[PDB]
Amino acid sequence: REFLVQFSTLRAEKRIDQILLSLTHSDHLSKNDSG
Amino acid sequence: QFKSWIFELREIVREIKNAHYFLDSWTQFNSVGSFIHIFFHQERFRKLLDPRIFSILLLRRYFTIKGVVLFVVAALLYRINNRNMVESKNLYL
Amino acid sequence: RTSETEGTRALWISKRWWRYRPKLPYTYFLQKLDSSEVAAVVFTEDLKRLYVTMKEGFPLEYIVDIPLDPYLFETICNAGVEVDLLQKRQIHYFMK
Amino acid sequence: KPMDVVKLTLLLSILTVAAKKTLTLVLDPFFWMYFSWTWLFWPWFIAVGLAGYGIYCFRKHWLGEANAFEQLGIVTSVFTWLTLVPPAYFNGYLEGWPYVFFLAYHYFFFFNVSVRKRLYGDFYARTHDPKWDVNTPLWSRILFGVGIMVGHWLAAFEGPELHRLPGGWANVGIWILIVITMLMHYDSTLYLARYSEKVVVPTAVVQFGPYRWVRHPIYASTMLLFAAYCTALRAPLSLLFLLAVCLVYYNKKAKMEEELMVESFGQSYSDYADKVRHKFIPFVY
Amino acid sequence: TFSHIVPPWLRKTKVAKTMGKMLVNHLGLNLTKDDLENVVDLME
Amino acid sequence: NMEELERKANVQLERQLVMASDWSRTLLTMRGKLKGTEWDPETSHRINFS
């Protein structure tokens, strides 16, 4: 039963916009005195 | 029982702020919106200027034809852009 | 007639289109064109507007809407005024 | 009370006479005709009223209760009367460079704001060491500002008339120079801000990116966009005067900041300065 | 990205040999003797 | 010079009257006070070329 749900975790490949959004990610708020 | 209809409506709204799967027009809408979002942000603009960012996607039939259609359309629009509608002002004057 | 203003009429209108040129009638445009009071006459590329440019006044330039008749062009000739047509590009009739 | 009736009747009479004046002004032919006569001069009215709004917001910000909208409004008024007005009055018309460089200034002011929203909670000023921020006598600051405007207006005036400058392959230089100055300024700001804990409190010495070509790349990038605007209009003398005044003020401020980090960091900034001597221009200054 | 395309003889060209050394000098990655001696006596 | 000034004023007042006349015309057009006159006519039967 696990093979079907792990085979369908990505039935279609990631879109160009998604890959381009992920490829240019940033640090996101490490240098704060609170966190 | 009318609350269930609103529940389904806004649950579908929640699903369409995702990319599970739906009609092609909304997917094109989200793609051009994501392109606008990437382009407007400057800290997302600079990381585009790294050749590896292009290269990973380049090394990964429909796409080439879609990109070459916009080539001839752009060529048409640029060629029409340099000419005055009246070439001979004097001969029509 | 070797005026320094050889061709600086249509282009300058194409730049300062943002100006507000008030309206004037056809018959007064004729009556002041004949008078040798106007410095230039400008034709729009659809021949449905005409931006006058006289020598003195406040403002200099206006807008006169035009009927297509030959006697218009006859008095434009016999007045002895500067005749030119603004040429738009080929996208503006595809943008519309 | 009768006094309420009397004051209400007085207000009604004043409103009646004011509305009579308003109605006889609205239906007035000569008033509308002269209104259209003064409709001829519309673009210069917003350009001058923005100066009044900007000085009002600037006095409020000097007092200290200005929202961020008023600060960006001051920024916008400065950018309009330094990159939209100089060829709107000294040519009468805008086409080509002024819109591009007006938006380029807005684009160039927005890295110290963008970075300090990203790598922070907000723009709120963190408590810090009072001697860290570089401060200069106010007469020197206004002298620098006046010199910068004199250079920019002089580039506008000494530059030729607007639509006669060429195109084609000769307008690629400003493109690449603007790209270079944006890239180098962004690298300088990022390398300066990725180490400091607070707003300006550096921990180590930055010797990466443009810092290994020049000792002050932020100031030289501002210098280079100055030169970019001046070169887009093809005026060398105003570029030279801009260079002179910015060299004087930036060199003064660089000398105080350099002696501050020499005192504060000891041998580290000394060897960094020995590695790269050129302060503003690569192997020129 | 760029070493996948550059020719071998262009790499063995003296220009590419002197380009790398100026890259190291500008970036500051000169590896000296005393560095490696301090490293070897730093280990255990 | 006085004649120049006065005839400048003469042609300028001519333009004053023509633009003011146009403005008063378009101001009176909408209010319906000029309804029925030749500046706001009413439709009728068609007509031929002859």
Swiss-Prot record, chain B:
Localization per record: Plastid, Chloroplast stroma
Top-rank taxon, per record: Eukaryota
Coiled-coil positions: none
Disulfide bonds: none
Protein family membership: Belongs to the Ycf2 family.
UniProt function note: Probable ATPase of unknown function. Its presence in a non-photosynthetic plant (Epifagus virginiana) and experiments in tobacco indicate that it has an essential function which is probably not related to photosynthesis.
The protein's name in its UniProt record: Protein Ycf2
Annotated organism of origin: Arabidopsis thaliana (Mouse-ear cress)
Gene assigned in the entry: ycf2-A
Shown chain mapped onto the complete sequence: 5 to 105 of 2294
Curated annotation (Swiss-Prot), chain C:
Induction annotation: By high light.
Subcellular location: Plastid, Chloroplast thylakoid membrane
Domain of life assignment: Eukaryota
Reported function: Probable ATP-dependent zinc metallopeptidase.
Stated family: In the N-terminal section; belongs to the AAA ATPase family. In the C-terminal section; belongs to the peptidase M41 family.
Official protein name in the record: ATP-dependent zinc metalloprotease FTSH 12, chloroplastic
Organism per entry: Arabidopsis thaliana
UniProtKB/Swiss-Prot annotation, chain E:
Family label: In the N-terminal section; belongs to the AAA ATPase family.
Compartment annotation: Plastid, Chloroplast membrane
Subunit record text: Oligomer.
Phenotype when the gene is knocked out: Embryo defective.
Domain of life: Eukaryota
Cleavable signal peptide: none
Stated role: Required for plastid development during embryogenesis. Might be involved in chaperone functions or play a structural role in the thylakoid FtsH complex.
Protein's recorded name: Probable inactive ATP-dependent zinc metalloprotease FTSHI 5, chloroplastic
Curated annotation (Swiss-Prot), chain F:
Family membership noted in the UniProt record: Belongs to the AAA ATPase family.
Tissue expression from the record: Ubiquitous but preferentially expressed in young leaves.
Gene that this sequence comes from: FTSHI4
Residues of the full protein shown: 102 to 151 of 855
Species in which this protein is naturally found: Arabidopsis thaliana
Disruption phenotype: Embryo defective. Impaired plastid biogenesis and thylakoid differentiation in embryo. Defects in the photosystem II protein complex formation.
Subunit annotation: Homooligomer. Interacts with FtsHi2.
Protein name: Probable inactive ATP-dependent zinc metalloprotease FTSHI 4, chloroplastic
Protein task: Functions in chloroplast biogenesis and chloroplast division. Required for plastid development during embryogenesis. Might be involved in chaperone functions or play a structural role in the thylakoid FtsH complex.
Cell compartments where the protein resides: Plastid, Chloroplast thylakoid membrane
